[model samples]
Target chain A: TKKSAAEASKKPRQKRTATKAYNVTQAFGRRGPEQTQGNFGDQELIRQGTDYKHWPQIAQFAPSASAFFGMSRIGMEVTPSGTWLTYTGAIKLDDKDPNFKDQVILLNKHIDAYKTFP
Target chain B: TKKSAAEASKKPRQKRTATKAYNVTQAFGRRGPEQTQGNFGDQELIRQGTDYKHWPQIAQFAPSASAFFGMSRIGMEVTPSGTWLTYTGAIKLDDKDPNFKDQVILLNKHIDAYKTFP
Candidate 1:
């Protein structure tokens, strides 16, 4: 019960920190390419007052999800309409790897799928 | 010139913060699930002393990258063998979605591709 009480006391602080992080994200913009801008039509998918910190909750409604562990940060986001998105970062594969062509094919496949939506 | 000097001073502090965050991540473990102990054989792909903060550099070697904007966190990681991995989070889609089967197929395809190695 003491442990439970300690955890409960920590909960509000954790939530406050998350809120602060969200506010900072809002003020400074996102970590990667701007989702609301560019030609991706992403703004239509993201609703105003959407909190990036709540991505975990939104991810559950996504049709699919993917990750490239060492090549990407492990995080999740959800479009207001339920489309799930992951960040691929700005990295490209090396051309000299023996599996280069095949890997490229696979990358293209995932990127293509990421572009599709509701 | 003053702005540039200010930015220069801020850079080191930023690096220090990143280092501190890395240390915390190291001592406490990673944000998502453990990649090393799973059946994925991810241990072989990651090298000792690998810095997660340098994911951007490793991502450059990946053949491809993908993201689901609102459904995922925006980050990257790379294997020593150049295999890129991403975290798919623990969220599952609502089964009642209209495109459930197709989405699952895509998710499976990406997950399968993520498992392939050099």
Candidate 2:
């Protein structure tokens, strides 16, 4: 019981950072295109989601969430509802001998069953 | 005209979609130990940070940001500073095969030099 006053005063992170890690996999790594725009803030992101939503149970397109080590900064803009837009920045998967390696034979092998971390 | 009021009335996804896709890669494939915790919302993430910050020029530990196609879900909780908190998620780089394929050779190779796509 060495911990005391100091520790007590230090409130916890309140649930704390992100606790869940989802292994995003795709088939051989697929990307739509490169498109860019002004800085899309968090709230802005929610306002303009992706067209992927058009697909059943499709996840929203999030560059911030997808800013990997190796990828294209240029990409395309498409609305899940059905309107396509153009910009800069792109969507990419890092799967080279050393860039990222073979995370999986198929980037999309892990559908809903994709891998997860603790 | 076919492209009249009806077309103009089409619903736009507000700002519209994930126009940018980031490729997250590591030197090879790095992952911390696995540790499980409850669900941490977006707000929760900001509340608690990671230990990486202590290292300077370090990016925060984001399992959500690190999710790939193939990986384990049991990890650790070491705050960016010394404030150590926790989470239940595993960070993995998808560069293997099928899962995400060789998006890059080294997940972390692209400190900034990594490739970009169109």
Candidate 3:
């Protein structure tokens, strides 16, 4: 694992695939079945693909996986190729909603991680 | 299910979805199915109802499910009741790829999502 981390930090800037990378904005857990359930999450987005390399885009890396934090993000982009591995993390707050009471949400995340968990 | 909402807004902020929101960051797949798979998610969050009400940050709730996105995120924040249900999603990129010939990735995420899927 130490070898991987050491190897990971070396000249990764040489492998970037995009001229800029795609930035997306989204709202989660606000409508549809979520709305029907009477339960919802703080709607928001977290981005890092532009700054990281292993984060792979939908157009380039098709079938792939990644992680988020000290726990497990577990995702399948369903791509077909990749040569190296990676990972990362973050934290946010639930600042919106209207179901029961009390405000404030705790949001923590991490990703682009490969084969190692946070 | 239907009545919850009607009841939700009537006096939420009154019932409070909060108590101790003990949150935790997680890194999934990177080391296990994720790492070998080679991929990851963004490291961030999007919360709501810090004013919304029933986002169920933590404590008062246990072993429940939340959804994100237009799809389905599916999660086990491990709470009870919510008496209803919830979900959400987001999109991040593989901003950190290596062992390859190229760099630049795309990040797409949906969180605190649920059983439905992305």
Candidate 4:
């Protein structure tokens, strides 16, 4: 009887919802702004693969996993291992309705935090 | 007894759609052509958190992954304990759409096939 209930709960919800798909792309460390051609600083390109040294810094600005997956911030670090780049700070693609109000709230929160930060 | 016409013709059509949500973001990483900033390599900084040892010459270009949540690249060696980040390629987000295209055709057929693998 317990098993049956667990199985039932796992069933898909009755509501038929439409989901919008986004094409996601990734590039590890192509030449970023810091490594163009001839500035005046060290020509240290971030290379193009994974560099473990920057983990702590990434952690400092990393975004939440849910927000990361939802593509909320223009940037985020989901975990020590995961990172993301996004367009806006309010677009929660996974939300049930993807409402703008929710996005505005998130934006306001972001602004408040940004102001608070040194 | 043919109860309820065989329970409305057997079982329900179990449609389980497993989806992957790719976290996306964007930053104005590109620099214009005349800035020595000439190369536009001005006093800019593409800071980081995740960088890794070159997997395949860092591709000289980069790596690609499947659309959304498919975090397929496994750099860190998986052990009996759990998954940890030894090394891996990360995503560079966009401020717009995030599609990576289908798995086939796009890589070889349409383009030049990464320079004949010479």
Q: Looking at model 1 chain A, which ten-residue stretch has the lowest summed lDDT?
A: A12-21
lDDT (tens digit, per residue) of candidate 4 on A1-118: 4334235333221111111111111221111223111111111112211232322322222223222222221222345433332222211122333443453333233221312333
- Candidate 4, which CAPRI tier? incorrect
Q: For model 3 chain B, where is the 10-residue window of minimal lDDT?
A: B58-67
Across A21-82, the per-residue lDDT of candidate 3 in tens digits comes to 22112212122333122122222222322233422221121111111222223332433443
The two-chain DockQ for each candidate, comma-separated, is 0.03, 0.03, 0.05, 0.04
- Residue A34's C-alpha lDDT in candidate 2? 18
Per-candidate local distance difference test:
0.31, 0.21, 0.24, 0.22
- Chain B alone, TM-score, model 3: 0.16
Q: Write the per-residue lDDT of candidate 2 for residues A8-28, one digit (tens) a residue.
A: 223221111111121012111
Residue B109, candidate 1: alpha-carbon lDDT: 35
lDDT of 1 by residue, B1-118 (tens): 3234234234211121122223312322233334441111132223321244343322222221112332233333456756342333223344476766565444333332324545
Better of 1 and 4 by DockQ: 4
Q: Give all TM-scores, in the order shown.
A: 0.20, 0.17, 0.20, 0.18
Best by TM-score: 1
User: Which ranges of candidate 2 are over 4 A from the true structure?
Assistant: A1-60, A64-70, A74-88, A92-118, B1-24, B27-51, B54-118
Q: Could you say which candidate leads in DockQ?
A: 3
Backbone clashes counted, model 2: 96
TM-score, candidate 4, chain B alone: 0.15
